[PDB]
Amino acid sequence: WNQKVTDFNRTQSSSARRLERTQLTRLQDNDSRPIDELPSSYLKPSPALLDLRERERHLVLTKRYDEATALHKEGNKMEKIEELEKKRIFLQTQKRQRQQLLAAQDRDVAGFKERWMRSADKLNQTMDAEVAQQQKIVDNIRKKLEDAKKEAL
């Protein structure tokens, strides 16, 4: 039965850190992906920005250039305020997702052990029953042998 513990240990040790290497694998990749870029979907401008550059088009096309300079000044100003915001929102969302993904790996580890503690509990239960019976029977015979001896010594 002591040999069964070794087979228990090798099965547990191989399976435990098979999961642990895999648990790091998905965390290794997603945690160091491109963060210094705003993808295409995040670059969409506000509708208020559309009219300013639409009205700036006609100011240029009508050959009214003095007034076109003012709107270009306000257009670039209104981009900088809006560019900073979507950088913050993407960085806020990007930070959350890795936190959200990371917390899922450890929950599976918590459930991973529950499958292994109880399996050892059943193994420990069968461990105790057989040796106790073997010691119970042999001790009685050892007691019985001395009981017959007690008639003489």
Partner: protein, 427 residues
């Protein structure tokens, strides 16, 4: 106590929703002003799924109606059913729809999005439990395709566990109501694949064909065409609202019919449908129902299953009926036409029975199926999209709103890989 929140987007959604709320209000015996004038106690057992109660004996639907232009909404108000809905659940913009997917998604959709979400927060967090949400929209338009998908992403972010069932109308292949449809249909499907758990596809052509073939209507208006759609929407949730011999709600339906997360586009069909004059002569029984359901002509989506194979199929039965008679048909219809089911999944037909039928009918049955015949639907739109995209000028309407041409490539590629995936599980 498995509450469902209902959302209607655009012109197509409101007209479907308006007809839909008549059907259930009749089923539960509810007056249009909101009072129960009903005929039995069993209608009040689990009415909480769809209606909220206002002190005074009035029942208010868990509905939010969404539009970009106020024209559609006022048709609901001026209509017969214009008092039932809560006033605060009408949220509308003051800009044209544009009939444009990009403009609705990015330009006007953002402004309405935060206003919409808080209304849902009022409805979503008002009930003890919440099984899922329900959205009705069309894919060819601009508001339902553009703003409808935007809301579907946010709802997934906030309520990941809940079932986001959607009923969608796909652009027709022969004659269609909008020119820019291949651009609107392609971009919407990319969003729908990764977001919604379940999608039901409905085509207007089959409804014209079904009414003209079976119901023998000479002049089918949208009133009767939407009536066929509303029967499917009520039939799916009938297990929640009434007792029965064997229950099966949405999450049972999603578990059984969906073998992989991406293959979840469904076709629907309803039986019995019989001519208004021929109904007297018809001996409607359990075996008769199955003949109509699996018949290719009763499919509400124009995708002939005989050109593909079935992966999973589900049938819902309503009314007092034999469980033995129901079970035998699932054997026979699966065994008689073995060329139309996948071999590596035995028992492809799911079944369920509900106690209480809809009004007028002693027994009725509903069919939901997933098949590789859907490759037909997406092949048509991709070819038309490719035909138009070869001349990038129409894209200028979408570029002036901010959409980049790469997003067309991303959407088409994701749709293409879905088609190839259906092909390879056919073997």
């Amino acid at each position: 106590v498995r509450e469902i929140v209902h959302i209607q987007a655009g012109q197509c959604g409101n007209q479907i929703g308006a007809k839909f709320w008549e059907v259930i209000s009749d089923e539960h015996g509810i007056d249009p002003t909101g009072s129960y004038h009903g005929d039995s106690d069993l209608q009040l057992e689990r009415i909480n799924v769809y209606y909220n109660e206002a002190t005074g004996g009035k029942y208010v639907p868990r509905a939010i109606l969404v539009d970009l232009e106020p024209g559609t909404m006022d048709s609901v108000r001026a209509g017969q059913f214009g008092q039932l809905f809560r006033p605060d659940n009408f949220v509308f913009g003051q800009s044209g729809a544009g009939n444009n997917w990009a403009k609705g998604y990015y330009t006007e959709g953002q402004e309405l999005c935060e206003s919409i979400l808080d209304v849902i927060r009022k409805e979503a967090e008002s009930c003890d439990c919440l099984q899922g949400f329900q959205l009705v929209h069309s894919l060819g338009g601009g508001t339902g395709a553009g703003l409808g998908t935007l809301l579907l992403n946010k709802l997934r972010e906030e309520y990941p566990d809940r079932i986001l069932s959607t009923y969608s109308i796909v652009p027709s292949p022969k004659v269609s109501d909008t020119v820019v449809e291949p651009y609107n249909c392609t971009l919407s499907v990319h969003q729908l694949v990764e977001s919604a758990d379940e999608v039901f596809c409905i085509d207007n052509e089959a409804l014209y064909d079904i009414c003209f073939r079976t119901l023998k209507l000479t002049t089918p208006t949208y009133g009767d065409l939407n009536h066929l759609v509303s029967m499917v929407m009520s039939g799916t949730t009938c297990a929640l609202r009434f007792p029965g011999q064997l229950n099966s709600d949405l999450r049972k339906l999603a578990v059984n019919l969906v073998p992989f997360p991406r293959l979840h586009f469904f076709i629907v069909g309803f039986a019995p449908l019989t001519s208004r004059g021929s109904q007297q002569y018809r001996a409607l029984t359990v075996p008769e129902l199955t003949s109509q359901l699996f018949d290719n002509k009763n499919m509400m989506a124009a995708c002939d299953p005989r050109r593909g194979v079935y992966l999973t199929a589900s049938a819902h039965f309503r009314g007092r009926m034999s469980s033995k008679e129901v079970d035998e048909q699932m054997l026979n219809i699966q065994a008689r036409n073995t060329s139309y089911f996948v071999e590596w999944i035995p028992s492809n037909v799911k079944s369920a029975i509900c106690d209480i039928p809809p009004r007028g009918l002693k027994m009725a049955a509903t069919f939901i199926g997933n098949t590789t015949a859907f490759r037909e639907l997406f092949t048509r739109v991709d070819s038309q999209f490719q035909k138009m995209y070869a001349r990038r000028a129409f894209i200028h309407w979408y570029v002036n709103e901010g959409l980049e041409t790469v997003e067309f490539d991303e959407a088409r590629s994701n749709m293409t890989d879905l088609i190839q995936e259906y092909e390879m599980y056919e073997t």
